Write a protein that binds this ligand. Structure first.
Ligand SMILES: Nc1nc2c(ncn2[C@@H]2O[C@H](COP(=O)(O)OP(=O)(O)OP(=O)(O)O)[C@@H](O)[C@H]2O)c(=O)[nH]1
Ligand SMILES: Nc1nc2c(ncn2[C@@H]2O[C@H](COP(=O)(O)OP(=O)(O)OP(=O)(O)O)[C@@H](O)[C@H]2O)c(=O)[nH]1
Ligand SMILES: Nc1nc2c(ncn2[C@@H]2O[C@H](COP(=O)(O)OP(=O)(O)O)[C@@H](O)[C@H]2O)c(=O)[nH]1
Ligand SMILES: Nc1nc2c(ncn2[C@@H]2O[C@H](COP(=O)(O)OP(=O)(O)O)[C@@H](O)[C@H]2O)c(=O)[nH]1
Lengths: 45, 34, 433, 118, 428, 434, 428
């Protein structure tokens, strides 16, 4: 692996992901805004 | 988390129960003749 | 200490009783031969005799044989004491008179005796749950006779009258209009809560929510049985907010006269539609209001609610019930009377509705509302219009006059029924100030 | 039913937060304190006392169903912006010529905003 | 031996009390049966306040559980801590109020007040010094508000010096649980205003918000609500049970709170209420306990303090904290929110610092508030009441038990009056 | 918190519905049984978990005639749609708006509004109501009007888009279409928000030239309309760079009150063989959406001026290449643009590459969907008028309408307001000379 | 100790601030879980300006996330540094703004402003000496503009003596992203002019130019574009985060760049920017930093400063560097280019030089320029607004949500009455 600083220009993208679903960890329940903790991220992993 | 799992399971249990009843209830409707 | 005695009257009542007791025996294990297969929760409905036998605290009464002479040869013959099932020998032949004056004054004595015996083997009686059809003789005639004397004796004791009310269109009796007006004139000041469950309604609900195009009086009784098992789940099973029989009156009947609450049940699915439904407390509550899931053909939207009592049997988390009643208290479709700011009773139990090998499905949660809508004015108006299409031509008056009912009564009865109209209207008006 | 206010806890019991998307009944915000007793307005049976100048609306609510509603229903939104005087007059006379839709439980509740170019 | 007699009443009372004793026993060691299977002897230094040792090292709770039909009582006996109570301390009947204050204060109440009073007497005369009596009840509904109010009145007459804290689930605002609730409440408060000392007010819509918005539970049970009321009911009586700097008992809380006789309806509130996933983003420090306790979203009574003035706040902190980190936060929360605190009273906040925190939390704090905003509750019940009495609604089931209308009318006046005192002192 | 109730009304609808909900499913995994073959919450925009692991479509198919809906109640997707969400009736509506807004249509309105309420009382944040119909048919033009109006009475100022099959520019599958179409536009001119329009003749050609399908049927067409409903709703289902919700299409398109008829056009609609020779790059995909041979509504956008165009880039679209393209298209003096709209190009760059239904169209790693409101739709309204008049002149085929509940006069008020609409497109066109 | 409350409103504000929290978490050593994993003790020295302490060494950003559509916060949470914010600071509402300034300002956003201001109040009183607020938004479109300026007005009337920095993404000259960007920009600038003390205008076209011509990026994403705005963000709040000589915090910068209260719109710039083919051709020195700073290629707003005069200029350096070179370079640029600077302000450039550079560089430099060239941006919005407003185009929704003709007339007249004092300095 390659460890480079977070300076602009070093934000290389993985062009293998085809899954891009967002999960609804912000939603509403019986009157109230439940703020769930995310168990999955972008892609379902 | 464990609590939720038990709850979701009970729902699947009822699911199968009702699923069965359906078949054993549709029969009495197909018994309209006999 | 939480006992209640059932006084099933008429073929209608004797048949609603069959289903009711099958469900009561199932709920508490009591076998068809009265013997709980190896706790004290049946005492609300079943008393235990020395010889380990749980006998029913009930009095099935018909002014003819047949109906009850079939419960004594049925699968529940070793459950009912061979004295509770009281039978006459000549039906009241659709004549309130032949059930309040003739064939009836010859059975009231025995009935009240069996009631006293069952009512002396009870430390604390919550009340008498009566079952009658507002159409036939026994159903109208005897219920009155019984209610009037029941009052004289057990005075304060509650008297809940679960009853089958004439339907908008369908009807299996030409003398129904009369009988009805008559019974609701005598049981208007001697009854308490009178839950009305019209059949046309159930017939429809069945076809629509259960997909049983051609039902039968059974399919009906079973659903009416689940309504009663819901009113008496706290007097037996455990709950978060328990409601005694005594409560269903205090917190429902507004003014003495307006004692005719309506009925409705939730999760009425068919184990196949219930596979695509969530049956959440909100879904179940909003459905107990939907005009298509009411047990008396009458759109409450064209009326004004006076006191709805919503019972919840199953896994009902308290906050769910709150958000539900709250969303109702916001929708415009539902409107209430001005004199009733707070207008909702809430009873949250824990025992999931039981499944009697029949039609509905096993559900986790289920509700049962008893609203006192003013939309039932149409019913009284319709019913009286019919009593007037006939008591004008003096039709079928010779029958009642020839068994007692001095003609004069028909009139005084329709007069009180006209007061019913007035009350419902006025008790729903408003004040500019 | 009066649909009171829970004061601090109202963002929960707002209509659109309790999953009610149809136009819902409003909530009464300020509670008015009165003093002394309040006289009886009715009798034992529930009938109003004779003096008692009464209301004029129907004793039942005006739920105007799918066959009682007027044909060619006016729109819920009307903002009269970048619209001619004739079209503005047509829309305003439409929503004024349907009066019973405006006063109903299942009513329209229109929003009439904007101003046409003179 | 400052002692306490917990008189429970009705479903709400018995149920809330069941959890009170569960919460209180866990802290004092008493086990399901009644044995001190606990550690720090400090949990046995002042067990007299709530327990009466019985030959055998068993500690029996000083609690007269009252009810009008053995029902919630069966559930109490079936629940975990249900054999802890003494069989005889359960006075019941055979009827039921049916959500009728009359059937609880006149009909089925009269023939069941002697039995309760007789147990209160055996549990009061067996005390070296009875600080007073607690009553967990529900102003909305019979029994708790019917037989309960009758009891308070009688206890008052006999013991007129001892305190009479009344924890009351007040008729919630948005949704209701009894149609005759307006009537019931109006009547019950007309009695409490002139028979009690510290009536805390615990609406339920409030507690529900604290459960879904603060603790973050997507499935609340009446049990979780009970625990929260059982924690406030515990904070008020910590200094009369455990050591600590600036100690403060029940009489003190009143003296340093009730301004003028009547004005005494307080609003409770706990402090370290956090989430099973937010206890990683917060910090248990006195500063934060101060903020949570003084935010109008933690109070257990829908009456936005903001629409009003605090005549006297009470803060019982349990834990080892720095007096100057507490004394200071009080001054600041008063000097940086002046419009919401009466200016005709300096230092509108008392302060107790006990030294044994609720098992599991480093620091805690209960909040007793005598706000002027409590008018909203009484003014809502009066409006709901006037909407009914005006048109004799559900009143035959009251005048048919004997209640004359003068009684009902009086009730409204007393309540309507009290509704003024609060606004007189809410605007200089 | 991003749900979208879809009311599919009429053969066209029930049929575009089949196509739309198949794509919806293959995208989130929901199999033809609901049960998602997982062993996450994105599906909520269109599906509603029962808890037993069954995902039920959030839709209300409504058709006064059986047949169409009945083939959905007995087919691959027969266990997905909750029975009471497929509400058919008994008798048809004989291509007669009248028996769709007055007689055999005001009977199913009560139940459909009922179902729509339950599918709304379960949403934690509704975005709008996507109504799919055909301007030219009983239910399509009749039930929609009644449904739309009654919706406005309830859900007041709530979004209500309208994907529609606009009357054809020459083909047509009815003789009374013109009438129903003019009547429908009138009852929805003030009750609908942004009604998207896709002509069939157009898609027919786009399928013979760009998708190499010599004999296209309604399904080839229906499935392309499903790709458009995806891009319009993609932002509220998958992550992206410039999200676009269903409340912005009403603001960044509908210019003045009446004018609310955007037109649809898709990009990378290529065909395998002709994709082994194409760099389908942001620019190519964009320039294509503005070519007067792809506009899925035969209306040569050159014979008119653009009023507002919102592009929706779905896939691997470098944000910079978008700004570049829109610039190039702006320079091109061929494409025109009104003066009262300096900035007329809206952009939404999502990330989920277009989904491939096991059937047709290529697997593109980039695709756009334009929704412009060209003033060139005026020709269409004029053509519809020529037709309405060529018949109204002899009050032809009006007996049927007066034979239901449409008072002759209504026909006049309708075309009269359609003439107003045409005069409006003239004003919104002329450029202030000052 | 100084604190900054970070507000992020809108999709653009949420994404830019998410990248900024990534940047500053890398700078301070905060891992995605929220701990400290670093190398120097200079990172915890001034960490109490963007990070609140929690239990067990958790550092949590003091950021309020505001959006009327809870969908972009979802991607922010699903990103790498998602489990670092407070769940109670995730103030969202179920709604859709639809890019209406009217809907973000005079309707549904007004139903969220109370909860937002509650969270902002909590974060502001959980401090020792608050210095101000940093709001990230985009003028073009809704939510960031309408709701953002509503919070600007509310926070300004609550705290009138605190520095408000608005990082605003202005509408683009070449292409556009919302149809009603002239309307939103006109109303939002009308709100910004008499309100905020500092406004940094970032234009996306200028970001594309500095990503293609300077960085030579092949596939620039919004992460890349947001990163340079984040770099200017980290550069401006440097002196109160790391030690150095001639410290200049936000208020000192505001004093030294605004000569008049209305002239607070700035043009940011970062300039250790070098291409992938040229960092090994790079000739690292302070004069090339000045050269790559001042040239009209790294300006992050689409306003050529050569087409006007610099009113005021700031440079915040970051790295161990000599003072002679810095001082002589920023005298030399003014002495050489004399027509690009105002003559009535002698030496119209400020210098701050901190010691600790970003991890990966040895010298960094942040440019702030208050110049006459912002007249081009405001004028461009003026003819776009006038062409859209003469024909009453797209005014349908702005008047349907409640606003009026005079709103837009006043906004355009105020933006012209700011275009006049900008151009009067070009002619003295
Ligand atoms: N569940 C159920 N309900 C029934 C049954 N039979 C009748 N009913 C209801 O009872 C109503 C009529 O009851 P009644 O007319 O009072 O019967 P009756 O008084 O015994 O009159 P006769 O049968 O002629 O002696 C019908 O309208 C039904 O609604 C039944 O077998 N099962
Ligand atoms: N994609 C697609 N378009 C259709 C389909 N059916 C009809 N259309 C178009 O829609 C127009 C008429 O369709 P509809 O209005 O939905 O027909 P309807 O309302 O169901 O009326 P009837 O079926 O004739 O009773 C035709 O001119 C077609 O161009 C279809 O199945 N798929
Ligand atoms: N906190 C809490 N409140 C309860 C509980 N059970 C019931 N309540 C409240 O008690 C009220 C009704 O009690 P009530 O019917 O008067 O009981 P009764 O005194 O036996 O008649 C309801 O409004 C409930 O909110 C509980 O377990 N905990
Ligand atoms: N620098 C940067 N700008 C962005 C990003 N995402 C969106 N924008 C800008 O945000 C503007 C539109 O955002 P806006 O309409 O205000 O979103 P809203 O607040 O939800 O209404 C566009 O012009 C984009 O240039 C990002 O990730 N980084």
């Amino acid at each position: 692996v390659h460890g480079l600083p977070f300076l602009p220009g070093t934000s290389f993208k993985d062009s293998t992901k085809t899954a891009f679903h967002r999960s609804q960890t912000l939603g509403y329940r019986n009157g109230y805004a439940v703020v769930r903790r995310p168990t999955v991220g972008i892609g379902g992993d | 988390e464990q609590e939720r799992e038990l709850c979701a399971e009970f729902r699947r249990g009822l699911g199968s129960f009702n699923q069965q009843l359906a078949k054993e209830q549709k029969a009495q409707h197909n018994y309209l003749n006999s | 200490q939480r006992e209640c005695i059932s006084v099933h009257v008429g073929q209608a009542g004797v048949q609603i009783g069959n289903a009711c007791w099958e469900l009561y025996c199932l709920e508490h294990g009591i076998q068809p031969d009265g013997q709980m297969p190896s706790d004290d929760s049946f005492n609300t409905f079943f008393s235990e005799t020395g010889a380990g036998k749980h006998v029913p605290r009930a009095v099935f009464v018909d002014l003819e044989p047949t109906v009850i002479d079939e419960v004594r040869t049925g699968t529940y013959r070793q459950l009912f004491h061979p004295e509770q099932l009281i039978t006459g020998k000549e039906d009241a032949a659709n004549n309130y008179a032949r059930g309040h004056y003739t064939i009836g004054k010859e059975l009231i004595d025995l009935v009240l005796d069996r009631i006293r015996k069952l009512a002396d083997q009870c430390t604390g009686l919550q009340g008498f749950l009566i079952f009658h059809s507002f159409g036939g003789g026994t159903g109208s005639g005897f219920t009155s006779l019984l209610m009037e004397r029941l009052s004289v004796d057990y005075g304060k004791k509650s008297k809940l009258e679960f009853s089958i009310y004439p339907a908008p269109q369908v009807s299996t009796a030409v003398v129904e209009p009369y009988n009805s007006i008559l019974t609701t004139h005598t049981t208007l000041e001697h009854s308490d809560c009178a839950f009305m469950v019209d059949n046309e309604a159930i017939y429809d609900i069945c076809r629509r929510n259960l997909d049983i195009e051609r039902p039968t009086y059974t399919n009906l009784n079973r659903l009416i049985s689940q309504i009663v098992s819901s009113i008496t789940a706290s007097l037996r099973f455990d709950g978060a907010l328990n409601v005694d029989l005594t409560e269903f009156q205090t917190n429902l009947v507004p003014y003495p006269r307006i004692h005719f609450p309506l009925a409705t049940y939730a999760p009425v699915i068919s184990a196949e539609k219930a596979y695509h439904e969530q049956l959440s407390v909100a879904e179940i509550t909003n459905a107990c209001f939907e005009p298509a899931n009411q047990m008396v053909k009458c759109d409450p939207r064209h009326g004004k609610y006076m006191a709805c009592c919503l019972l919840y049997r199953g896994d009902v988390v308290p906050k769910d019930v709150n958000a539900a009643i709250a969303a109702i208290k916001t929708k415009r479709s539902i409107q209430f009377v001005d004199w009733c700011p707070t207008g909702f009773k809430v009873g949250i139990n824990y025992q999931p509705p039981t499944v009697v090998p029949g039609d509905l499905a096993k559900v986790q949660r289920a509700v049962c509302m008893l609203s006192n809508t003013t939309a039932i004015a149409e019913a009284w108006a319709r019913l009286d219009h019919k009593f007037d299409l006939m008591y004008a031509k003096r039709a079928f008056v010779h029958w009642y006059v020839g068994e007692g009912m001095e003609e004069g009564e028909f009139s005084e009865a329709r007069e009180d029924m006209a007061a019913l109209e007035k009350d419902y209207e006025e008790v729903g008006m408003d004040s500019v100030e | 039913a009066t649909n009171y206010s829970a004061n601090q806890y109202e963002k929960a019991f707002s209509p659109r937060y309790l999953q009610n998307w149809s136009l819902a009944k409003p909530t009464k915000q300020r509670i008015s304190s009165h003093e002394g007793y309040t006289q009886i307005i009715a009798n034992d049976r529930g009938h109003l006392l004779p003096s008692v100048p009464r209301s004029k609306a129907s004793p039942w609510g005006s739920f105007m169903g799918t066959w009682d509603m007027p044909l060619k229903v006016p729109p819920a939104r009307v903002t009269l912006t970048s619209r001619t005087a004739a079209g503005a007059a047509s829309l305003t006379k439409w929503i004024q010529k349907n009066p019973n839709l405006l006063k109903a439980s299942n009513g329209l509740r229109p929003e009439i905003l904007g101003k046409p170019h003179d | 031996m400052r002692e306490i007699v917990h008189l429970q009443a009705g479903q709400c009372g018995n149920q809330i009390g069941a959890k009170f004793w569960e919460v209180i026993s866990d802290e004092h060691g008493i086990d399901p049966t009644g044995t001190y299977h606990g550690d720090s002897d400090l949990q046995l230094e002042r067990i007299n306040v709530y327990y009466n040792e019985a030959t055998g090292g068993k500690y029996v709770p000083r609690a007269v559980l009252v009810d009008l039909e053995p029902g919630t009582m069966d559930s109490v006996r079936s629940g975990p801590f249900g054999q802890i109570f003494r069989p005889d301390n359960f006075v019941f009947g055979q009827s039921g109020a049916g959500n009728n204050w009359a059937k609880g204060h006149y009909t089925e109440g009269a023939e069941l007040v002697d039995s309760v009073l007789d147990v209160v007497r055996k549990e009061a005369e067996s005390c070296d010094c009875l600080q007073g009596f607690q009553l967990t009840h529900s102003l909305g509904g019979g029994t708790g508000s019917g037989m309960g109010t009758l009891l308070i009145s009688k206890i008052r007459e006999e013991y007129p010096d001892r305190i009479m804290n009344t924890f009351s689930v007040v008729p919630s605002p948005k949704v209701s649980d009894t149609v005759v609730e307006p009537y019931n409440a109006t009547l019950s408060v007309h009695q409490l205003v002139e028979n009690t000392d510290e009536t805390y007010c615990i609406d339920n819509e409030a507690l529900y918000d604290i459960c879904f918005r603060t603790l973050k539970l997507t499935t609340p049970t009446y049990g979780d609500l009970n625990h929260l009321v059982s924690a406030t009911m515990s904070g008020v009586t910590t200094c009369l049970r455990f050591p600590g700097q600036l100690n403060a008992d029940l009489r003190k809380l009143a003296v340093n709170m009730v301004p003028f006789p009547r004005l005494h309806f307080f609003m409770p509130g706990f402090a370290p209420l956090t989430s099973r996933g937010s206890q990683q983003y917060r910090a248990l420090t006195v500063p934060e306990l101060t903020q949570q306790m003084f935010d109008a979203k933690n109070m257990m009574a829908a009456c936005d303090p903001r629409h009003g003035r605090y005549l006297t706040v009470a803060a019982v902190f349990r834990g080892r904290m720095s007096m100057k980190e507490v004394d200071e936060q009080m001054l600041n929360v008063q000097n940086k929110n002046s419009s919401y605190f009466v200016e005709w009273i300096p230092n509108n906040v008392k302060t107790a610092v006990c030294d044994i925190p609720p098992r599991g939390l480093k620091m805690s704090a209960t909040f007793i508030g005598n706000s002027t905003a409590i008018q909203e509750l009484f003014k809502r019940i009066s409006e709901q009441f006037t909407a009914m009495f005006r048109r004799k609604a559900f009143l035959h089931w009251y005048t048919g038990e004997g209640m004359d209308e003068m009684e009902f009318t009086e009730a409204e006046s007393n309540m309507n009056d009290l509704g003024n005192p609060v606004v007189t002192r809410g605007a200089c």
